[PDB]
Design a protein around this ligand. Structure first.
Ligand SMILES: Cc1cc2nc3c(=O)[nH]c(=O)nc-3n(C[C@H](O)[C@H](O)[C@H](O)COP(=O)(O)OP(=O)(O)OC[C@H]3O[C@@H](n4cnc5c(N)ncnc54)[C@H](O)[C@@H]3O)c2cc1C
Ligand SMILES: Cc1cc2nc3c(=O)[nH]c(=O)nc-3n(C[C@H](O)[C@H](O)[C@H](O)COP(=O)(O)OP(=O)(O)OC[C@H]3O[C@@H](n4cnc5c(N)ncnc54)[C@H](O)[C@@H]3O)c2cc1C
Ligand SMILES: NC(=O)c1ccc[n+]([C@@H]2O[C@H](COP(=O)([O-])OP(=O)(O)OC[C@H]3O[C@@H](n4cnc5c(N)ncnc54)[C@H](OP(=O)(O)O)[C@@H]3O)[C@@H](O)[C@H]2O)c1
Ligand SMILES: NC(=O)c1ccc[n+]([C@@H]2O[C@H](COP(=O)([O-])OP(=O)(O)OC[C@H]3O[C@@H](n4cnc5c(N)ncnc54)[C@H](OP(=O)(O)O)[C@@H]3O)[C@@H](O)[C@H]2O)c1
Ligand SMILES: OC[C@H]1O[C@H](O[C@H]2[C@H](O)[C@@H](O)[C@H](OCCCCCCC3CCCCC3)O[C@@H]2CO)[C@H](O)[C@@H](O)[C@@H]1O
Lengths: 530, 530
């Protein structure tokens, strides 16, 4: 299988495109829009078929935790990115790896039909007249933050409500909602970012939840990004092995350092969970300021008031904004292919339909991991390109149907029953899973003997995308290197001002003690017991 | 002295006005503007004689750490205040205590002249024609954040610079500086707030300092306001008694918890100091995002570039904003009265001119303490009204001239040599000083025996304004009370969503152990040593 299809030029489209040329395939990318990036290409209107983002979105993952395994973000980039500055990375990636030539822009995909199976018959439309073609295999990168989910039916009285109401998707700018009374629904990173942005210049903002989330800043230990302290092999172990509610005590304490969540009033119901927490740096302060007040779930709505689950009422609310998240569909696809039933997506590892017979089609970017997606869809694409070729193989339908069950059953146990968590997954464990398949996952134990400086820094240090190019196929020398020098690149854009003292004999601080102090303790009651 | 003058209807004017009626005097307040609040009354233009604030200023002191000693902020107020919501408190204070009748608006004061001394002859102008009157004593509340300090002469090349440049004072709105390259000077809470606000929607913002400050959020331990953990008798002791550079290690560690200041690049020169640190909740994040880059002092300016002290250069900078702070003058006053020479204000405790012979004039609000000013200028006014009457007395000029020296000599040693710190002062120590004079400062030691629940909470708990109405003159029953119930009022506006489980036999935390665990340890090797 050489002639391959990639639906959409999202992030996922661009990485598969590269993973393809890398496994020596010939890809054709269809893009509905004029340009690349999908979600991350901010436009002011809300054009259909592509996800809207509000002008002021910043990423919630470090640059050295979210760059591709063999392509670090330039040193002069900040560790969290304005959507526009991220797009740039993408553009700069599509330049370096010459991926832009396969993109057919303004060429939406209308149907992907099976041939007499191992190929596919894809109907696309260009500017008016619609052509047709056949492909050996298909990669689907159409996104899943496009269909707004607006659960109006669990807001009795909405009909009666005057004012103005609209879903997060629609949101772009705050100018216009000056000094208005505004209620936002949900504790989506959307809800939070929105509420906050609007709250600075608004009369009052509220924010509804039944369940309440845990808030958390991207600022972490010594102002290093949260993800490079949170996502580290070693810590993952702890989360997995340690008893569930011993990890709960651990979460509670970690999360509460910033502020007491009970007091600020977004204590979660079941702290049991390990759902995705919200990554706003402003929300706690903005509550403190009083610009936002959290609130129980809207019980009922009237013309200009809102009743609440705890029997409170807020009056003269000019605006409701439903940041109740999104859904996803495949309207160019067999209705049996992407079977999604009772909160469960039947896809082998959110990728392959198990009821296929030739493993020639997979869904990339239909997943929401606790860490960055970009390195996730890269290993998604590595595993897939290699399956198509046949260098990699699925088990039997029997096996794949059994995994899909047990994965989902674990998942709901770990992230709750919400319609917002169909695609939740622990970050590393998954990344490992994908790299086992293609045998690109380092086996540290063995490596400890060869290279201990790595072994330590791979397990205890931050689990970069880079790690997955140490062993296995299609490697990158600047992977060992990248890892060892990431501290430079993280501080390049920050540490923009120099004192200039010394570190050979400075009377500042003290240090060295911690070294010598323990060194002597080493040599204690260890006299030769043969 | 009955007939008293209060220059200006600032915060200081309004508290003296109240302190006056309270010590049974008859005041006349002159106000240059149409209304009260001075600084805190946001207007869109920058009218002369009154301090400008930018539309979006929030306080940097808790409500229960900054309300007046006998007038708590309404419970439904947030703990940090939009300038407008603070003004409201003031208006609500001017209502309750009926102070608005003494205010002559649109009546600026032109000269305060000594009579044949113990009175004063004040020339004021109304709408056109200027009248005159005599007063027994004078209280000056004209502010000191009105005269911009623009040190153009330590920016070689400014003449050459095209673009646009203007001082913090002038600032109001960010709209207009979209996608412009902008450099702000200094690490004033101004500089910081400004830089930040502008940075979200700007091409790039820089922020110059030679010296670099310590940044710190208003969010503190368990999301309680910083001031109620920082400003507590007990902690003050530590700061005073402990060796200077042992308090340094203590600051370093406290401050650095949020982020490593070296890495983010505002490591201070001499960490020795206890200068005022900046209170921005946003700046660390906004650096991380890359919207602000800190920078060494501007060495030199050109037409569209800026050279730096460390030999860096930023290019095409459309705007310079000098947030280099303010100064102060008294243009309605004898030039010998407020003698200010080589970084030293010769005023007994930033209040009384020592070269007077009848102590009948004092300056209130000419001071910048590490805590809230509002309770500071209240004890300033209590001490003063009582001096006028003669219930309180200054020492001899010999003594007062010696204090002024030693105070200043301590001060420079403690806050550095900057002309941004002429009026710096440790918060409590001063508040105590003022309350000693009128004997309203509790002596805890004695009270330990009488009331231990207080004694503990007065020393170890937060040092509210309320404390100074426990003993001494003009008290308030709701002072003991206020103190004991402040936790309610702080949580009233925050804790706006409740779970409803239990706290008599609930499973999914633990607690009580820490109690019983230590309790048993108490009764160890203490068997009757008579
Ligand atoms: C607000 C927000 C913030 C996020 N922040 C982060 C973050 O900081 N870090 C992180 O790792 N992840 C983040 N994510 C998740 C993830 O990065 C995005 O979901 C990611 O951009 C998805 O890329 P994709 O290629 O899968 O989908 P998209 O980028 O949505 O790609 C959609 C593409 O498919 C095309 N398309 C659709 N239909 C057709 C058709 N019929 N034919 C041809 N083309 C079609 C579209 O036109 C478009 O080019 C965020 C998500 C949201 C909503
Ligand atoms: C941005 C900013 C934020 C701050 N935030 C805080 C905070 O959160 N907490 C805190 O404790 N401190 C804060 N401060 C410091 C402090 O609160 C202010 O300096 C305080 O408002 C000063 O009050 P005042 O009465 O001394 O002066 P102002 O409130 O400036 O009083 C000036 C008034 O006097 C009048 N006047 C002037 N000249 C004359 C004259 N010749 N005759 C008659 N009337 C005259 C004016 O017309 C005006 O009405 C802040 C300062 C700034 C700049
Ligand atoms: N980088 C960024 O800054 C950024 C910004 C925005 C979004 N994102 C991305 O997009 C997602 C963030 O969340 P989202 O806002 O897009 O959608 P989401 O994750 O699905 O969350 C939407 C929220 O609406 C809540 N909700 C729905 N119905 C509700 C009801 N009746 N009452 C109360 N709450 C209700 C949900 O709570 P329950 O599910 O518990 O009911 C959920 O918390 C993440 O997956 C994130 O990666 C990222
Ligand atoms: N609630 C709020 O958010 C808020 C907001 C704004 C202001 N305020 C208050 O207002 C007061 C004043 O703040 P402000 O910023 O207006 O004035 P400021 O605190 O005096 O700050 C002025 C800054 O300019 C710097 N500067 C002066 N000369 C310089 C030079 N030659 N090179 C480089 N930098 C130089 C100063 O540094 P040097 O000390 O080295 O001169 C200082 O950091 C503060 O006490 C604060 O409490 C509060
Ligand atoms: O968060 C600051 C709080 O902590 C301090 O205690 C210090 C202690 O005195 C110091 O010796 C230790 O270093 C170890 O740190 C703590 C934490 O600041 C003070 O006792 C307390 O009043 C203050 O409000």
């Amino acid at each position: 299988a050489k002639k391959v299809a990639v639906i959409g030029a999202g992030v996922s489209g661009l990485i598969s495109l590269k993973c393809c040329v890398d496994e020596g395939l010939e890809p054709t990318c269809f893009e509905r829009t004029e340009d690349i990036g999908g979600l991350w290409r901010f436009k002011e209107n809300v054009e259909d078929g592509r996800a809207s983002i509000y002008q002021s979105v910043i990423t919630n993952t470090s640059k050295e935790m979210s760059c591709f395994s063999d392509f670090p973000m330039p040193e002069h980039f900040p560790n969290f990115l304005h959507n526009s500055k991220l797009l740039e990375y993408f553009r700069i990636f599509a330049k370096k790896f010459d991926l832009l030539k396969y993109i057919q822009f303004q060429t939406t995909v209308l149907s992907v039909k099976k041939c007499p199976d191992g190929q596919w018959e894809i109907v696309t439309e260009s500017n008016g007249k619609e052509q047709s073609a056949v492909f050996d295999a298909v990669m689907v990168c159409s996104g899943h933050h496009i269909l707004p989910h607006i659960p109006l039916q669990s807001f009795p009285g909405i009909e009666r409500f005057k004012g103005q109401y609209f879903h997060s998707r629609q949101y772009k700018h705050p100018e216009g909602f000056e000094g208005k009374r505004i209620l936002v629904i949900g504790i989506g990173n959307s809800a939070s970012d929105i509420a906050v942005e609007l709250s600075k210049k608004a009369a009052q903002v509220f924010i509804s939840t039944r369940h309440g989330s845990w808030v958390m800043s991207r600022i972490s230990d010594d102002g290093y990004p949260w993800d490079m302290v949170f996502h580290t092999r070693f810590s993952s172990m702890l989360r997995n092995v340690l008893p569930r509610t011993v990890v709960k005590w651990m979460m509670e304490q970690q999360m509460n350092r910033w502020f007491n969540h009970e007091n600020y009033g977004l204590e979660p119901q079941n702290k049991y969970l390990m759902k995705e927490p919200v990554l706003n740096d402003d929300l706690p302060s903005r509550l403190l300021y009083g610009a936002i007040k959290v609130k129980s779930r809207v019980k009922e709505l009237t013309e200009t008031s809102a009743i609440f689950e705890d029997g409170t009422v807020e009056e003269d609310i000019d605006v409701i904004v439903f940041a109740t998240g999104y859904t996803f569909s495949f309207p160019f696809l067999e209705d049996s292919l992407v079977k999604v039933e009772n909160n469960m997506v039947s896809l082998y590892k959110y990728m392959f339909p198990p009821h296929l017979e030739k493993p020639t089609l997979a869904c990339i970017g239909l997943i929401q991991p606790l860490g960055s997606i970009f390195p996730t869809v890269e290993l998604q694409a590595r595993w897939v390109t290699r399956v198509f070729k046949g260098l990699c193989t699925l088990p039997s339908e029997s096996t794949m149907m059994a995994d899909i069950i047990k994965r989902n059953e674990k998942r709901i146990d770990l992230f709750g029953e919400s319609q917002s968590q169909i695609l939740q997954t622990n970050y590393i464990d998954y990344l490992d899973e994908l790299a086992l398949e293609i045998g690109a996952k380092p086996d540290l134990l063995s490596l400890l003997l060869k290279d201990p400086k790595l072994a330590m820094k791979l397990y205890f240090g931050p689990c970069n995308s880079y790690q997955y190019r140490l062993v296995g196929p299609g490697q990158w020398e600047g992977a060992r290197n990248a890892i060892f020098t990431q501290k430079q690149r993280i501080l390049k854009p920050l540490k923009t001002r120099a004192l200039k003292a010394s570190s050979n004999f400075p009377v500042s601080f003290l240090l060295k003690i911690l070294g010598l102090l323990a060194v002597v303790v080493a040599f204690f009651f260890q006299l030769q017991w043969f």
